[PDB]
Amino acid sequence: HMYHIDVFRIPCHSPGDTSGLEDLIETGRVAPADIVAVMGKTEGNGCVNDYTREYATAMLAACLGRHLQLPPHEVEKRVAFVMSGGTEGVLSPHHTVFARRPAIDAHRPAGKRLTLGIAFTRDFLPEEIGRHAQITETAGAVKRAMRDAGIASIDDLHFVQVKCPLLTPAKIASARSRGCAPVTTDTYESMGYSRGASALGIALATEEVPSSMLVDESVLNDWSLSSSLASASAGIELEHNVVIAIGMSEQATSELVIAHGVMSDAIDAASVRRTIESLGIRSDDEMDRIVNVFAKAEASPDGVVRGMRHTMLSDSDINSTRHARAVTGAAIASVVGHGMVYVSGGAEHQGPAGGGPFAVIARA
Amino acid sequence: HMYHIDVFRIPCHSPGDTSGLEDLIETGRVAPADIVAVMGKTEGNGCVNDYTREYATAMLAACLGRHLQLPPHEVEKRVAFVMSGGTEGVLSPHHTVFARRPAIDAHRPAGKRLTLGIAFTRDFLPEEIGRHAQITETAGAVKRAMRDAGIASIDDLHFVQVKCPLLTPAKIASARSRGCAPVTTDTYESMGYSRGASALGIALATEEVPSSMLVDESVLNDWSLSSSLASASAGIELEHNVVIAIGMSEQATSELVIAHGVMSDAIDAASVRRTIESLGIRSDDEMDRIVNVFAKAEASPDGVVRGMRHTMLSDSDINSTRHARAVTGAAIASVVGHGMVYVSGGAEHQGPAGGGPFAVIARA
Amino acid sequence: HMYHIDVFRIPCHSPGDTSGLEDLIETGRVAPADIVAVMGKTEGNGCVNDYTREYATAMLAACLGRHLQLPPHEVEKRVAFVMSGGTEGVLSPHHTVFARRPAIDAHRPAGKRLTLGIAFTRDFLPEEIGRHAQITETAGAVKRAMRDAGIASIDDLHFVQVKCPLLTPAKIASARSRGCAPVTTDTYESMGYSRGASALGIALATEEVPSSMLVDESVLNDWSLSSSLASASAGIELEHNVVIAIGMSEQATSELVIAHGVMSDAIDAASVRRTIESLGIRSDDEMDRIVNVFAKAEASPDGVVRGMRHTMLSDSDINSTRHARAVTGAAIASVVGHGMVYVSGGAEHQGPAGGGPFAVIARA
Amino acid sequence: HMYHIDVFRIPCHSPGDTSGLEDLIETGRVAPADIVAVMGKTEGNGCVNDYTREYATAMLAACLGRHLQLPPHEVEKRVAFVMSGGTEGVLSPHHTVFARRPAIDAHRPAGKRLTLGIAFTRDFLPEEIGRHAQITETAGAVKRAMRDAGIASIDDLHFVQVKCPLLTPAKIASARSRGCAPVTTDTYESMGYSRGASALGIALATEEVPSSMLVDESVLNDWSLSSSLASASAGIELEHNVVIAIGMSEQATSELVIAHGVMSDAIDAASVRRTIESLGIRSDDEMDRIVNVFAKAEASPDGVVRGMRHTMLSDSDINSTRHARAVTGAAIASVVGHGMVYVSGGAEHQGPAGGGPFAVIARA
Ligand SMILES: O=C1CC(=O)NC(=O)N1
Ligand SMILES: O=C1CC(=O)NC(=O)N1
Ligand SMILES: O=C1CC(=O)NC(=O)N1
Ligand SMILES: O=C1CC(=O)NC(=O)N1
Ligand SMILES: [Mg+2]
Ligand SMILES: [Mg+2]
Ligand SMILES: [Mg+2]
Ligand SMILES: [Mg+2]
Structure with a gap:
């Protein structure tokens, strides 16, 4: 659990554009194998019907897929793709690429340095979204992600990104069929529930909120409950949660x-x-x-x-x-x-x- | 042409809300007769189909109409209503009310003070919008507005608001019927043309742009041509231009x-x-x-x-x-x-x- | 309770346009005093932030206000204004004006004819919307409206329009302040709740749904529960329900x-x-x-x-x-x-x- | 130039969904090599910033790419992908897949049958869009497409689809740089120009409109000029025109x-x-x-x-x-x-x- 992290901000001319990345590879500045995470801003609406997020991932996956000779669907289990849509006003579409190499045991620099780790949860049922299941499963992923990252204490944790699902009429209908009612029937509103439960999952893991308070009812209701580290982004492209823990360790050489x-x-x-x-x-x-x-x-x-x-x-x-x-x-x-x-x-x-x-x- | 100007920023709970103003009157802080201009931000889209602008004016007019015992349509000739729609992000809907009393005779301090004057143009034909007619007619209104304001030189001028018309399919069709083609057939785009010609009208008047360059063709085309004082706002609610010159004079006591x-x-x-x-x-x-x-x-x-x-x-x-x-x-x-x-x-x-x-x- | 009803479909060039109506009056085709209801389609979005509905009413009210020498706010108590926003696709903005004269004594033919009656409920608290209060209060208004209309039985009832309120953040916050939580915090979604409870109120009154099933929980949930006569339209312009019962009676001469x-x-x-x-x-x-x-x-x-x-x-x-x-x-x-x-x-x-x-x- | 055509309407659960097609292949109902064209409805807005169209093609291309062992970018030159975005109201997203085999010289049926042929134009410069270049280049592609199709006369032609480009600020700026002004600066409006010029290109080829009338000026202006066969769809995903001629020939056995x-x-x-x-x-x-x-x-x-x-x-x-x-x-x-x-x-x-x-x- 000792790493050297490289981070690259690369512009996108469009959601499908990978040329920023093809370049980084071809000019030897990053190794496809080393890439562990990507955080994108895509120019869809960032709401329910945003397929720019999915699309961006597809092309990235397929690009790294060529280089690693893996199926794209395989690359996505290997790499944490987090595409946040909606680039309004001056927001410029781009990817932020994260690469992880073993602690280049050159010399550890003096102070602590950037480290990063990832984690996934199981798929969620429609009726689980915005609810206990999602909260607790996320918390668990956060802990795995810190471990992965080599993050010693909550002190050393500085940012926890989470990609999470949302509700479509089909999913809602599927939940209904099982005699369970979804946290809401408004698809847009479901994003907030998914984001909110996920964030509380992080708050739980970070011991920022005590386990006893985190009842289903408190989701979207209790404004007081929050993580000051959590960044949640909902999406139609996935049924599970994707977690990226980011922080500082002495073992890192970034x-x-x-x-x-x-x-x-x-x-x-x-x-x-x-x-x-x-x-x-x-x-x-x-x-x-x-x-x-x-x-x-x-x-x-x-x-x-x-x-x-x-x-x-x-x-x-x-x-x-x-x-x-x-x-x-x-x-x-x-x-x-x-x-x-x-x-x-x-x-x-x-x-x-x-x-x-x-x-x-x-x-x- | 010696004035005391009062300016009040009042919040709107909605486009039709006049209670901010009814208050100013009832608490004796402004006289209905003294009010010479109102500059609003209304919470429509600020585009073609924004009736919040019209609506705001209607209620303001009717409110001052009661107090001055005039018809609302009469108050609108008397007072310069400028409603800019579109209050996105953190933009809070409000009116900015301007009242003009004769130079509050008495003490008046060293240094210039705020003054303000208004002006109207004739109604425009659909085919005149975004074109010579609108440019020159606006320029003329700007001069009258400065005179009204008691503004000595261009130096003392600090802001020129102009409300202007836009094109609807009916107006376009009307123009067509007369064998003239409108500056565009895209209604949204027409707003830019109307705003742009109007702004050049101001640039003309302020001698910021020479008369020879102001050809129809240069409107929306020639980025280099501009007024650094002009603020143009297009709207479906009117067929003429409304001009509000704002600046500094020694004669003012504001x-x-x-x-x-x-x-x-x-x-x-x-x-x-x-x-x-x-x-x-x-x-x-x-x-x-x-x-x-x-x-x-x-x-x-x-x-x-x-x-x-x-x-x-x-x-x-x-x-x-x-x-x-x-x-x-x-x-x-x-x-x-x-x-x-x-x-x-x-x-x-x-x-x-x-x-x-x-x-x-x-x-x- | 014997009436002659006249109904006029009049076009609007815009939400504020009353010329269709000024005409009907000036050409003697309807008496301002006889007008009992107006059902409009206005060209706002028909959603939360639609002020075209309010605006249309304001101008209509003020127009009839001139003719009846009443305040506009007075005319609105007298006449049932129902403005439904959203005129998408080929939908053409218009008003449908309803006038009621006492049974035009004279000939009256064999077979029932059109009759119409109106009713209002009290204002609702934010926390009452989409809930029991609104359901039962509406049902009560429906009965009064039938009585007003001179509608003998449910058989003779053919249409029940209901205008109802919706939730804004202020209303939500107001409800919160009193320690009650609103039926939802999504303003758009609140419209559905308001519409849905109101519709069940009608279903109740029409004995189309039994009183025992109409629990708060069943609102938006239980698809099976419905009125086949109910037309609900939510709006930001009002805090109460407005009901218009329409049907057939032998007493009518329309x-x-x-x-x-x-x-x-x-x-x-x-x-x-x-x-x-x-x-x-x-x-x-x-x-x-x-x-x-x-x-x-x-x-x-x-x-x-x-x-x-x-x-x-x-x-x-x-x-x-x-x-x-x-x-x-x-x-x-x-x-x-x-x-x-x-x-x-x-x-x-x-x-x-x-x-x-x-x-x-x-x-x- | 003798063909057997198969056409398959397949549903999409989302823009990237190819399972409808993977099925057709795996169940032997169509051969990847035989596929010559695909016409999609994708659930973006169908306007300027619709990347659902591009995305759909990418996945289709890549799917057929696997099967034919070609690069996706290669498959796109081979197959005519036409993705029309915007699936509003009841419009259900789907692909319509076209496969062409040699006239299965089994027996020619009695009457004429469905045939189909495709064609591409060169890339266009920004300043060429909505103008002569695009009109004439399209007309030429239409003729090649009929030939490809084995369509004898204009009589036998029943449908001409064309995918065409549109203007972005970058393209506009690029055109400007060369001292040429684009047909418009409104990106949305550019779609109409691109569609319109393209359609006139078809009208030209079909001798539905005489060559002399087709001046730049007449594009979007002259409502009278039209093809009754033309279907134009603009898109950000391409710089050239894609043409699909569809009709009837005796040589076909579909x-x-x-x-x-x-x-x-x-x-x-x-x-x-x-x-x-x-x-x-x-x-x-x-x-x-x-x-x-x-x-x-x-x-x-x-x-x-x-x-x-x-x-x-x-x-x-x-x-x-x-x-x-x-x-x-x-x-x-x-x-x-x-x-x-x-x-x-x-x-x-x-x-x-x-x-x-x-x-x-x-x-x-
Ligand atoms: O900013 C965003 C965009 C997105 O993809 N989904 C979210 O919930 N947040
Ligand atoms: O043309 C304009 C610009 C604006 O900001 N809002 C308006 O209503 N008019
Ligand atoms: O709730 C509704 C539905 C509608 O059609 N339009 C409205 O303004 N209100
Ligand atoms: O219907 C449509 C959608 C699209 O992709 N572009 C068009 O111009 N037409
Ligand atoms: Mg927060
Ligand atoms: Mg500028
Ligand atoms: Mg229904
Ligand atoms: Mg046509």
């Missing part, structure tokens, strides 16, 4: 570090700057020391942002997650100077209500 | 001032802070010295923001103006601390391409 | 009749033709004997239409109610020859699941 | 036939029935003799359908093509009994203005 924080609301650029500061990035010229930023945005559920009304939860044309991503994307872009960042929407039990957790990865 | 600037792109929060700075506002606690901010946002027409791709002009679900408003709204909110600001979309010939002009109104 | 039926699914044009047939309308030239058609459309909740999959409940861009209205609008238009018909979306407990009740009003 | 017609407007179910009739399909039980229907829907550009107003061209939320597809989909479904049909939007120069051409493929 030329990279990670710090995290929390946005109090969608427009809290301050927090982000503050965290970027904490990594010793002090001018706009040092911003390119940042590989990427990962953030959670949501529409403040009380209907207000810093006292003023917002329309994001009343807008029947544009879903709130879309508003939120656009908003936070803009805020963060204004700080780091561009829109190629990972912003995901719907921060249910992820940091403060109306806010979300975020993380920064910079050169050591 | 307890208020105005400074302006330009955003280089949708995320240029810096410029805004800079301009806010220039009014002697430095801490977040002095931000409430700002009455309101007025800004123009657009999707960078070259398809990129600071080198990175954006999807705003490819998004067939959400129109670019909506993305842009959300984005700039967020940026500005992050600076002033909330979303109740005037952000309008589509900055064709309004400041830089991808950017727009903005203005701040603060306590003296 | 030159008009009404028959009803049910669509088995969104595309069941057959049923509609069948019902139109039953009124002795057989050629396309006799179609103008129809004053109007009123229909309920929904997206089949099982995710299929006649065995094939539909995407309406997965489409995060366009809400299902919008798909449904477009679909049924098209089907019905293909039969009657145009799109100026009343189609409302979301047929929860309104006729079959995936289907809805409809009614036709034709010349005697 | 167990299938094709007849075509034209819808006068979006709701003209009559025409469709009439054409279905003409193939000797007289009851609802014989409807399953239909393999598939292919239709073009558009929003009547004059803003009216059979005298009544429509909102499809004013709706800034939902694009007209989406309204149109939903509408015609519903109409056709009401006739054939379900929504698994090929309906494409935007019928510029394709049959009547407000209408479009359609075709039916049935068992002999």
